[model samples]
Target: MNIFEMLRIDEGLRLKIYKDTEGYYTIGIGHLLTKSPSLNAAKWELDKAIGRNTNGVITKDEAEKLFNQDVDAAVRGILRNAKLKPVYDSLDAVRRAALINMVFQMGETGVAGFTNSLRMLQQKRWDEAAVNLAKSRWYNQTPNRAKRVITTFRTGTWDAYK
Candidate 1:
C-alpha cells in the first residue's frame, strides 16, 4: 500500500502507522518522540500535533532508514494530486525532487494557501516564488525546515536533514 494510505489520514489526523521495537505506537514531530520508528513518521506526527502543516526541523538517527521511503511516497502523492504539470515541466530532476519534498512537508492545501507563491511559480518567476514561499505561514511556523527546503528548491540540492 502507499505510505499515505498506510497512514490512514482523515481530516489531517494521521494514525500511528508503525510500531516500535517496544511494541508501542509512537508519533511526534521532528523525530523527537521518545520512541518513534521513523523520522518521517515523527515529523509528520509532530506537524499535526503542533497544528502546523509542515515538517519539523530535526533528525534522529534511529529513524533515518525509513525516511526516504516515506518521503518518496509523499512527494508522489503531492505531485499527482496537485495536477501541477506546468511546475514540473521546466524543472530539472533535483528541483522537481526538492519541490516534491516541500509539498509533502507543506500539504497541497497549505502550499496553495500561499496564493502569491502559486502565482509566482505559474509565472515562472523563480526568485519571487522563493520569496513568497518564505513568507508563508508554513515558513513562519517551521523556520528551520522551511529555510532548508527553500534553499533546496533554489539550489537544486538535497540537504542531509529534512
Candidate 2:
C-alpha cells in the first residue's frame, strides 16, 4: 500500500482538536498543532487550510487536504536530506513507504538520529535495521506501530498491515 493509506490507518483521523498520546494538541490525522518553530505558524496554517478560525475543529475535507500536505512535507524533508537520499533511492516501494512513514511520524531530524538503522538499511541488512529501530524511545512509546514498520523493513511486504 501507499504511504497515504498506511498513514491514514496509523495516525487515524479527527475533526476536532485532541491531545495526542504524548498530550500535545493535535488535529487532522496527527498534525501536531503545537509543533516546533512556531505554534502560531501551525495555527495560522490550520486556519488557512480550513478556511476559517478552526475553534478546535475541522471538516473531513479540510482534514484530507491537511493530511496530503503533511505527507508531502514529510516526503520532501526525507528526500531533501543528503544522508537519506541515496538510502531512500535504494529501497523498494514498500521499504520506501516504511522510511517515509518513519520520517512522517518522527520528522526528518528525528529519524536522522537513527544512524545505525540507516546504515544497515543502506547495506540491506534488514534484521539489523529493524533491531536498531527497536532500540529507541519510539519503540517503547508506540510499540505496535514500531513493530509493524520494523516488520516491513525486515520482510519488505505490506503483509505487516494484515
Candidate 3:
C-alpha cells in the first residue's frame, strides 16, 4: 500500500491488536506506550525507540518493520471501536510519522483523549494541529522531540521527519 493507505490501515488497526504485555501498543513509526512513566523517562524511551527503529530516518521500511502485521491489527481494533477514520485520506510520509508518533506515545485512547486536537486535525487545520500539538502534556514533557515532529508535520520536511 501507499503511505496514505498504510496510514489509514495503521491508524485503524495496529495499536489495539499488537499491544505489548504492558498493554501498550507499537505503531508503524515505532512509538511505545505503557502506563505513563515520568514524562521525561517516557520521552527518553520513546525517542530512543524511534531513533533505533527508524535508524534516525523515518522510511517506509522502518515503519513496516516497527509496525508489522500484528501492529496493524491492534490499530484496526482501536479504530473499529471508535468508528473513526483519518480526517485526511492522503498523508505524506512526514504526516504519517507525526500521527503515528502521537498514537505511539499517546495510544489511540490518548489521542481520543485530546478532543480538541483531534477536532483540529479533522478540520484540516494545519496550524491548529501545530498549536494543539504544543498544548499537550506530551509536548510539555517532550518539548524538544515534540517540536521537531510538529515542525515536520507543518512543513513536510525530512529534516525532522525522522
How does model 3 score by TM-score?
0.51
Query: Across residues 69-156, which tens digit of lDDT does each residue of candidate 1 receive?
Result: 5566556665675545457565766666555555565556655566676566656676777887887766777676677666656655
Candidate 2: count the clashes. 0
lDDT of each: 0.52, 0.86, 0.55
TM-score of each: 0.52, 0.90, 0.51
Candidate 2 residue-wise lDDT, 1-162, digit = tens: 788888888999988866678667688898878754455666676686677997666888888988999989988887899888988999999999999989988888888889989999999999888888999999999998999899999999998887
Q: How far out, in Å, is residue 79 in model 3? A: 3.6
Instruction: Choose 2 or 3, whichever is better by lDDT.
Output: 2
Tens digits of per-residue lDDT for model 3, 7-122: 44324334221344355444444345334544444444444655653322344554555556435644464455452355323456556556655555455777667777666666
- Give the RMSD in angstroms, all C-alphas superposed, for model 2: 2.4
Please report the candidate that would top lDDT against the real structure: 2
Error of 3 at 152 (Å): 2.8
Runs in model 1 with CA error above 4 Å? 1-65, 157-162
Alpha carbon RMSD to native, model 1? 11.4
Backbone clash pairs in model 1 (N, Cα, C under 3 Å; residues 3+ apart or in different chains), count: 2
For each of the candidates, give the backbone clash count.
2, 0, 15
Candidate ranking (lDDT, best to worst): 2, 3, 1
